[PDB]
Write a protein that holds these residues in place. Structure first.
Motif, PDB file in Angstrom:
ATOM      1  N   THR A 100     -44.308  43.431  47.688  1.00 40.40           N
ATOM      2  CA  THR A 100     -43.417  44.267  48.488  1.00 40.40           C
ATOM      3  C   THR A 100     -42.454  43.415  49.306  1.00 40.40           C
ATOM      4  N   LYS A 101     -42.977  42.432  50.039  1.00 34.93           N
ATOM      5  CA  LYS A 101     -42.107  41.549  50.812  1.00 34.93           C
ATOM      6  C   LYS A 101     -41.146  40.790  49.904  1.00 34.93           C
ATOM      7  N   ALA A 102     -41.628  40.319  48.752  1.00 35.23           N
ATOM      8  CA  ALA A 102     -40.753  39.620  47.815  1.00 35.23           C
ATOM      9  C   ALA A 102     -39.651  40.538  47.296  1.00 35.23           C
ATOM     10  N   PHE A 103     -39.998  41.787  46.982  1.00 35.82           N
ATOM     11  CA  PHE A 103     -39.014  42.735  46.465  1.00 35.82           C
ATOM     12  C   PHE A 103     -37.936  43.016  47.500  1.00 35.82           C
ATOM     13  N   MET A 104     -38.337  43.248  48.746  1.00 35.91           N
ATOM     14  CA  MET A 104     -37.359  43.538  49.790  1.00 35.91           C
ATOM     15  C   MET A 104     -36.459  42.333  50.029  1.00 35.91           C
ATOM     16  N   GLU A 105     -36.991  41.119  49.881  1.00 31.95           N
ATOM     17  CA  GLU A 105     -36.147  39.929  49.931  1.00 31.95           C
ATOM     18  C   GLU A 105     -35.117  39.954  48.808  1.00 31.95           C
ATOM     19  N   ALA A 106     -35.585  40.133  47.569  1.00 34.41           N
ATOM     20  CA  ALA A 106     -34.683  40.147  46.423  1.00 34.41           C
ATOM     21  C   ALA A 106     -33.593  41.196  46.589  1.00 34.41           C
ATOM     22  N   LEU A 107     -33.962  42.393  47.051  1.00 32.43           N
ATOM     23  CA  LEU A 107     -32.987  43.471  47.186  1.00 32.43           C
ATOM     24  C   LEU A 107     -31.812  43.043  48.055  1.00 32.43           C
ATOM     25  N   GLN A 108     -32.103  42.397  49.187  1.00 35.70           N
ATOM     26  CA  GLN A 108     -31.037  41.893  50.046  1.00 35.70           C
ATOM     27  C   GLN A 108     -30.256  40.787  49.351  1.00 35.70           C
ATOM     28  N   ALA A 109     -30.926  39.999  48.513  1.00 35.75           N
ATOM     29  CA  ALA A 109     -30.263  38.879  47.858  1.00 35.75           C
ATOM     30  C   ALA A 109     -29.358  39.334  46.725  1.00 35.75           C
ATOM     31  N   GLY A 110     -29.630  40.489  46.132  1.00 31.91           N
ATOM     32  CA  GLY A 110     -28.806  40.963  45.040  1.00 31.91           C
ATOM     33  C   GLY A 110     -29.521  41.810  44.009  1.00 31.91           C
ATOM     34  N   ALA A 111     -30.848  41.756  43.988  1.00 31.19           N
ATOM     35  CA  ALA A 111     -31.590  42.587  43.056  1.00 31.19           C
ATOM     36  C   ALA A 111     -31.280  44.059  43.309  1.00 31.19           C
ATOM     37  N   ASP A 112     -31.600  44.884  42.318  1.00 32.24           N
ATOM     38  CA  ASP A 112     -31.447  46.325  42.418  1.00 32.24           C
ATOM     39  C   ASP A 112     -32.824  46.954  42.232  1.00 32.24           C
ATOM     40  N   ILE A 113     -32.903  48.256  42.501  1.00 33.17           N
ATOM     41  CA  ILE A 113     -34.192  48.934  42.557  1.00 33.17           C
ATOM     42  C   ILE A 113     -34.881  48.972  41.200  1.00 33.17           C
ATOM     43  N   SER A 114     -34.164  48.707  40.106  1.00 34.49           N
ATOM     44  CA  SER A 114     -34.780  48.881  38.800  1.00 34.49           C
ATOM     45  C   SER A 114     -35.688  47.708  38.449  1.00 34.49           C
ATOM     46  N   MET A 115     -35.643  46.628  39.217  1.00 33.25           N
ATOM     47  CA  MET A 115     -36.549  45.505  39.029  1.00 33.25           C
ATOM     48  C   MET A 115     -37.863  45.685  39.788  1.00 33.25           C
ATOM     49  N   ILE A 116     -38.093  46.871  40.367  1.00 33.82           N
ATOM     50  CA  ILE A 116     -39.260  47.097  41.215  1.00 33.82           C
ATOM     51  C   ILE A 116     -40.554  46.777  40.476  1.00 33.82           C
ATOM     52  N   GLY A 117     -40.619  47.103  39.186  1.00 39.86           N
ATOM     53  CA  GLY A 117     -41.827  46.872  38.418  1.00 39.86           C
ATOM     54  C   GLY A 117     -42.190  45.404  38.264  1.00 39.86           C
ATOM     55  N   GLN A 118     -41.204  44.509  38.292  1.00 38.21           N
ATOM     56  CA  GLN A 118     -41.476  43.082  38.188  1.00 38.21           C
ATOM     57  C   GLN A 118     -42.231  42.548  39.391  1.00 38.21           C
ATOM     58  N   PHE A 119     -42.323  43.312  40.479  1.00 36.15           N
ATOM     59  CA  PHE A 119     -43.022  42.871  41.675  1.00 36.15           C
ATOM     60  C   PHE A 119     -44.345  43.584  41.868  1.00 36.15           C
ATOM     61  N   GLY A 120     -44.758  44.402  40.906  1.00 35.97           N
ATOM     62  CA  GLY A 120     -46.047  45.054  40.935  1.00 35.97           C
ATOM     63  C   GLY A 120     -46.130  46.284  41.804  1.00 35.97           C
ATOM     64  N   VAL A 121     -45.002  46.881  42.195  1.00 38.42           N
ATOM     65  CA  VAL A 121     -45.046  48.023  43.103  1.00 38.42           C
ATOM     66  C   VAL A 121     -44.261  49.178  42.502  1.00 38.42           C
ATOM     67  N   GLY A 122     -44.244  49.254  41.172  1.00 34.42           N
ATOM     68  CA  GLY A 122     -43.468  50.282  40.504  1.00 34.42           C
ATOM     69  C   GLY A 122     -43.886  51.687  40.840  1.00 34.42           C
ATOM     70  N   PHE A 123     -45.161  51.883  41.198  1.00 36.87           N
ATOM     71  CA  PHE A 123     -45.617  53.226  41.521  1.00 36.87           C
ATOM     72  C   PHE A 123     -44.695  53.911  42.547  1.00 36.87           C
TER      73      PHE A 123
END
Ligand code: 7PP
Length: 210
Positions: A100-123
């Protein structure tokens, strides 16, 4: 009796982000839930190799998709390994903290919500389309439980008294009023063919009586 729990702070922040961000490519929620079901079926299949009695609670390994226009729900059913009470209350939130913390970091860096599954929190992408999620689950080693959350920082767990399941997990999405396209047969088929063509278990889409 119903027990009410607070989400881990990071998961509460993730849910708030998903609910309030403007993101039009919402269909990815269904890919993530099917992927989760596939992983759960893999796990019980594996365990049954060394202990075939694990399949006493049901030998069929499949995924069912059940739209209901009258209640405005989409239900995803699998006969996978299921979740214990400790999974629902503590374990899934604890393991999700790092991703979760890694995903929120990526989102600010440029990732988009569709990569959520790569961080294990797709649910949690379910809350792109649902105002409330109910999860009914039964693991071989535990009782049948119902988990529920409308976000807002808490979730409930109760022992389920509805119809027994044998084994597996039922995710019931209570859809937002403007997300009823995910109840349409043609739309569900489009999404499964695009995102889920190489899942190794049969996926059955139920048709509505109408
Ligand atoms: C209760 O609601 C959830 C929450 C809060 C978070 N994530 C998930 C995703 N998820 C997780 C599953 C699991 C597990 C434990 C093992 C060891 C089997 O991985 C798991 C399992 Cl076993 N099955 C399914 N279909 N989804 C699962 C859910 C359903």
């Amino acid at each position: 009796e119903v027990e009410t729990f607070a989400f881990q702070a990071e998961i509460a922040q993730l849910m708030s982000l998903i609910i309030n961000t403007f993101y039009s490519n919402k269909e990815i929620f269904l890919r993530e839930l099917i992927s989760n079901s596939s992983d759960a079926l893999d796990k019980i299949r594996y365990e049954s190799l060394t202990d075939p009695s694990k399949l006493d609670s049901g030998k069929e390994l499949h995924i069912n998709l059940i739209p209901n226009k009258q209640d405005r729900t989409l239900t995803i059913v699998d006969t996978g390994i299921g979740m214990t009470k400790a999974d629902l209350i503590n374990n899934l939130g604890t393991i999700a903290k790092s991703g979760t913390k890694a995903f929120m970091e990526a989102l600010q860096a440029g990732a988009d919500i569709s990569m959520i599954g790569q961080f294990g929190v797709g649910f949690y992408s379910a809350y792109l389309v649902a105002e409330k999620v109910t999860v009914i689950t039964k693991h071989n080693d535990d009782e049948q439980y119902a988990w529920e959350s409308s976000a807002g920082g808490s979730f409930t767990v109760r022992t389920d008294t509805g119809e027994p399941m044998g084994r597996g997990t039922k995710v019931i999405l209570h859809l937002k009023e403007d997300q009823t396209e995910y109840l349409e047969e043609r739309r569900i088929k489009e999404i499964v063919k695009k995102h889920s063509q190489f899942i190794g278990y049969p996926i059955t889409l139920f048709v509505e009586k109408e």
